[PDB]
């Protein structure tokens with residue numbers, strides 16, 4: 001019967017992002033915009049979302065007047081390292097002094113610095129710290145996010161990070177996708193035996209699988225870290241073990257991480273700053289989603305961003321993320337990422353919106369559950385303090401959120 005819980009009326013602009021799959025190449029530009037719209041919600045799910053009139057015959061218990069505001073699905077942040085101990089502010093001077101990201105790491109700092117902190121922090125402290133950051137992420141519009149482990153580089157801590165991720169997911173509104181990234185860096189105890197280290201991380205997959213602590217396996221394929229050869233062997237093992245594949249590829253040096261991702265049919269390849277044309281073609285060919293992290297580029301103090309236009313021109317499905325982490329991108333503001341995407345990745349507003357909703361969702365195996373406002377989907381949406389979708393990435397560095405809804409309930413009210 002047409003008796004539902006909630007209905008949003010007088011929506012100035014509604015972006016349903018309705019799609020039948022990830023958006024690649026030209027389809028990323030095809031943004032469907034509905035003026036003067038409405039959204040019907042019942043039992044935490046979307047009943048209807050479209051032109052004014054669709055609410056005809058319906059009786060709702062709660063009518064939300066959006067005052068001509070912009071409404072879109074809740075945002076998806078497909079790549080973060082949410083759970084971590086300590087912070088790296090004391091490393092700012094090293095970067096200012098011109099020491100490269102990799103040289104800091106080779107010095108025993110960077111990821112290895114955060115590893116010490118994360119290993120030392122209690123499970124309760126990590127949970128408390130992550131809740132704060134995750135709620136801030138929520139306040140900026142993120143209702144679904146991917147979170148990677150990778151600051152343990154040992155059985156105890158990696159497992160602790162995954163358990164924390166599980167707690168967070170079950171104790172607050174943001175839905176989380178967990179990724180095991182024990183292969184983030186080479187810990188001191190394995191400096192001269194990286195392959196053995198990788199095997200130790202692989203030995204953790206069975207129990208991680210049994211306890212459902214992670215759905216994907218990631219790795220940092222980079223100079224001074226893991227080679228393409230080691231990454232292939234590791235990822236193939238991960239796939240046999242039943243995990244989806246992700247990879248931090250061609251972030252700094254052009255090693256061919258992208259090509260490997262495509263060959264292994266990874267769900268996504270992330271960073272891709274130094275990816276070759278062959279890598280771009282391989283990504284498009286395999287349907288591997290290219291998750292760009294313009295925040296990390298900007299934060300590293302660099303001027304060369306990933307070649308997003310070339311990727312889109314070549315048929316790649318592009319996505320974006322904060323890469324929220326203490327070392328190279330300490331920001332929860334996915335909206336700023338949208339702005340950076342426009343100004344430095346040279347993406348259009350349309351492409352950007354598809355990037356943080358539909359493509360972000362598919363990049364983490366949630367293509368059928370998030371990023372779209374259509375019948376059956378969980379009622380996850382954002383009512384913005386803006387009249388149109390171009391305004392969001394246009395006005396930068398702030399929070400444009402008016403209200404955030406998760407499962408049909410307002411969880412953020414500004």
Ligand SMILES: O=C(O)CC1=NCN=C1
Pocket residue numbers: 081110111114220248251325326327328
């Ligand atoms: O530096 C960090 O903590 C995070 C990072 N991993 C790979 N690139 C950046």
Ligand SMILES: [Zn+2]
Pocket residue numbers: 079080081248323325
């Ligand atoms: Zn990352």
